[PDB]
């Protein structure tokens, strides 16, 4: 007996102020958070249908540790396209995740957020190359316009599913 | 790329007047058809979620032939619990399906319809034994009360999934 | 920020064979279970809308009390509301309701626990517990009574939704 | 520009105690009301899909037991005429509810469905065939319902919407 | 007995041509109206889920009066970010609403529409200060791109809910 | 007896690389495909509600030929706003459709895709005039941002419905 929808534990990581919370609140509440209130730790749930399968996303929004990294099945690694340092930090978030999961192949999506802003310092091609080198998808997002937001979370679920088979 | 929901081709068979159409219309329109208008052939579609999977049911409602039996992925074999003859006919519907599919193991559910009526002539235990001998589920239904209607169709989808 | 739907932890209790599992599987899978496979402990989830509010039901399906357990009290202590199920053709299951209710009051350490009384198997002709008797019992406890059939689906949604409504009243 | 779903104004009428409220609450809340609390006037809304069309049912639940009566009957687009299958008198009253509706709508052809409620109860006094003949003589559908078991409940309301749609074409 | 979903009566006001109709049609039909057909009065309904609660939005789309303002529970005050005059008019729409509701505290959201256009004449900071002075939310929208559209309406519903408690 | 939702057979046509596949996958999977994998032929289904009517979209995604054009009830004619040649080709796609349907009045929507790109070579007004000359709607889309994607498909369904009455 099927006992209820499949649950997926997703974790959003990345440097302070890249828009991890804004992405998540946009997904859950269809609301853009304009204020910058730094996060300690928040969790959110949403039921969605992805590729014809109903599921429950349990999303942990982190601060810019080993316990959440151990329980998470997939990770959104978020940088801001106008902050080169946030992009350089991605490497370290990814190594930390691989270390705590004790694995080379953890479901992950690279997210370049704030793509609505004119002040771009990270080229799409650079981020795409970085993602290709990790063998993971790259998505450009804006929590403000909602560009790529659903896609980033759904793509992560699809990565988790590929990794379970 | 997933191209849209899974489709299941379901066929409802059994003797004239057992309630094949009424079952189907109850599923699709939430409507009990009181009149008896014999069917030639009708098809119906419905999108439902079963065990967390979205699917598109394509349901062929038959008359009390080889082409529909060949394209169908699963069969509801319907008799009426107040008509012993309709129950005896099940064996023949099942052989015909096995012959046309050239298969011993075709997804199938045995459906005893009109369970709301007081004139029962087929015992549940007899129908359960028949179903057990075929290795298929048995469900009692009423197109009038809606008892078992969803369950019969959803169980058939689950049988199709096991067989894939 | 609202962080996602409200969750309600429901526990289904009552004597062995009254239809606790059948009720739950009928809710979750729209399927009537004809076989009797005794439960140790099983849990289920379902998202529903009740009174315009989306919620997530976490349902714990328990065993008939046969004997002592410290593990029993722990799982029962997680419930916010309880369906107390008897079978309308089994007078003993109805008499046991009192003991299920005392067990719940003891483990929740409370006199006022959201609860619904469920008389299952109402499709059967062999009725031994009258509707009026069960209604009077429920009235004496100050809780709703619902007659159900896991087979026909009569009252099944209503029993679970009514329990959610009781939980909501108790939170306000 | 389509401006949002189609709205249908439905009115439930019939003798005191036939189950008008219980039918409506069963539709709206999936809840059977066991108590008998007489209604003055209540309205309820529900969005449903019927034959692939999304609509908003605005349902007026009336009293069995008078300027207010004419107003609801005038705004209503379709009527469920409910009797209880164990109460012959409620069945005899149906004719008069139908005439009252025709009078208040000032029309001979009002979308209507005949509903025989309490079909779960053993003490049936109105035969199905009698009710079917009455409905046939009016040219309207007949549905047997139980607010307790939910038998026919959706069907009664959906069938009324289908009647309203036929009457608008 | 709960009688069906909660209903919210919303009114969209603001100067001629700011995009009141376009916002509303985008919400209801997922359609961008490119033509400018001036409105007399139109009403629209939509059922949505906001913060886990199902509700029925009844939306009155107004022309560039006391009766609609009296029955409305919340107001979207819309200006266009490329039209300074529409922004200056907001003050008058707000005073008119306060006068007709006989209230200092009416649920309201300030909407800066046409944020897809390059020809911006109202600074975000100015609009944010105006909204802060009124104690109401500010949202930038585009009926064309759909940026902020759901958020503007849902935020107004959230304001109405806060005001009912 | 209504036998289940209305089905609409939609065909997406236009020059190689304009984003026909990306538009369709964005509609079906909420996913932007960044790679360019040329299509031979693919079909997709989706149930949606448009103007209160539930329907089943059967969408044929074509390559940059008589059989699909004969079974299709409506056509999205897609060009890319940074590719003038794709825009000039529209005329020929439209003639090919009229020829195979043997009809002067085939439901059709003109779609200007890639409207997120800065390298615009086709003016919106030119495309609108072309659409006006055909008596069909014009919609600007981005498969990347999702701007106009639902609108393009829904508008085509509305065109199909007008043509059936
Ligand atoms: N323009 C624009 N602003 C954004 C975007 N995402 C976030 N912001 C803004 O960036 C600021 C920081 O956003 P926030 O979500 O708090 O970032 P964070 O990554 O969660 N910070 P922390 O790790 O401290 O919790 C906010 O003021 C927010 O409005 C975006 O996509 N576009
Ligand atoms: N009481 C009751 N009557 C039923 C039920 N199912 C069907 N009927 C009645 O049985 C009669 C025949 O039903 P119908 O659906 O036409 O049966 P069918 O198998 O499709 N006949 P055919 O093979 O001629 O198409 C109808 O008068 C119908 O109302 C049921 O479950 N209970
Ligand atoms: N006729 C009828 N039979 C039912 C109903 N509900 C349950 N049953 C039957 O009663 C038997 C016991 O049901 P089950 O759900 O396993 O009972 P349970 O309370 O979970 N037993 P346990 O406490 O051992 O887990 C099964 O054969 C089942 O089909 C009902 O409403 N009607
Ligand atoms: N068994 C059974 N009882 C029903 C059904 N419908 C209503 N009842 C019961 O009959 C009584 C009357 O129901 P109610 O819905 O209040 O009737 P009404 O037509 O709305 N009365 P009024 O006209 O005074 O508002 C209640 O006790 C109710 O539980 C039904 O289908 N079955
Ligand atoms: N670029 C862009 N154009 C817009 C936007 N919103 C509206 N428009 C355009 O602005 C014009 C006026 O829009 P309309 O919705 O009719 O505005 P309105 O406030 O309802 N006018 P009125 O008060 O006369 O009824 C239309 O041409 C429309 O396409 C937007 O967000 N972006
Ligand atoms: N920036 C942007 N790129 C897009 C958009 N739509 C498609 N593309 C890009 O353009 C390329 C071609 O898209 P694709 O859908 O394969 O084009 P097509 O019309 O189906 N090509 P074919 O006819 O060979 O099948 C891909 O690289 C894709 O990412 C869009 O709206 N914006
Ligand atoms: N629902 C509360 C829990 C808290 O901890 C969580 C940890 C992870 Cl990795 C994901 C979701 C979570 O949700
Ligand atoms: N949708 C039209 C088709 C026609 O033929 C069908 C064949 C089967 Cl087995 C099932 C459903 C069918 O429906
Ligand atoms: N007279 C016919 C009998 C009974 O019913 C039958 C049904 C089928 Cl599908 C085939 C053979 C049969 O044999
Ligand atoms: N003698 C009857 C027994 C007493 O103890 C019981 C305890 C429970 Cl929780 C339930 C039923 C019981 O039945
Ligand atoms: N929704 C407010 C209305 C007012 O009066 C009503 C009249 C009818 Cl026929 C139906 C529903 C009603 O409720
Ligand atoms: N549903 C029709 C009504 C007409 O008048 C309205 C008045 C307001 Cl404030 C809001 C919505 C409206 O819509
Ligand atoms: N700015 C000059 C006018 C003054 O009066 C106004 C009143 C309203 Cl409600 C709207 C716009 C107005 O603008
Ligand atoms: N169901 C598969 C079909 C194949 O041919 C199709 C033709 C059209 Cl115009 C649309 C969708 C199609 O999908
Ligand atoms: N640019 C001229 C070519 C000619 O042949 C074509 C055929 C089609 Cl279906 C569309 C565009 C074409 O473009
Ligand atoms: Mg944060
Ligand atoms: Mg038939
Ligand atoms: Mg059990
Ligand atoms: Mg009443
Ligand atoms: Mg307007
Ligand atoms: Mg392609």
Numbering used by the authors:
A (entry chain C), E (entry chain E), F (entry chain F): -3 to 60, 68 to 168
B (entry chain D): -3 to 60, 68 to 167
C (entry chain A): -3 to 168
D (entry chain B): -3 to 61, 65 to 168
What does the paper behind this entry write?
Although, various RAS inhibitors have been described in literature,24–32,47,48, in this paper we describe an approach for the development of RAS-effector inhibitors by combining different elements i.e. (i) the hit identification via a method of intracellular antibody fragment competition; (ii) structure-based design via crystal structures (KRASQ61HGPPNHP) and NMR (waterLOGSY and CPMG); (iii) identification of clear structure-activity relationship (SAR) for the development of potent compounds against KRAS and (iv) the proof of concept in mechanistic and phenotypic cell assays.
A truncated analogue of Abd-2, designated as Abd-3, also binds to KRASG12V-GppNHp, but with lower affinity than Abd-2, showing the intrinsic binding properties of the benzodioxane core. Analysis of the compound Abd-3–KRASQ61H complex (crystal form I) shows the best electron density in chain B. The ligand terminal NH3+ makes H-bond interactions (salt bridge) to D54 carboxylate and to a well-defined water molecule (430) that is in turn also co-ordinated by an H-bond to D54 carboxylate and the hydroxyl group of S39.
